[PDB]
């Protein structure tokens, strides 16, 4: 009936906001490492 004015059992908290905002980050970008197969690219 989408009219559930009943106060939520879990109220939104500020620390929750900052935590779930930070959660948007992931691991450091992983690039496929370059393979030095010969001497010139090593140089």
């Amino acid at each position: 009936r989408v009219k559930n004015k009943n106060p939520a059992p879990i109220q939104i908290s500020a620390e929750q906001l900052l935590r779930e905002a930070v959660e948007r980050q992931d691991v450091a970008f992983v690039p496929p490492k370059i393979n030095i197969t010969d001497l010139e690219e090593l140089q």
Partner: peptide
């Protein structure tokens, strides 16, 4: 010479390590 060579060999085995660790 040896440090360069060891770098080279590591590089081909890691280039082929993609096939080695393709499915794991």
């Amino acid at each position: 010479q040896k440090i360069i060579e060891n770098g080279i060999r590591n590089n081909e085995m890691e280039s082929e390590g993609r096939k080695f660790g393709h499915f794991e």
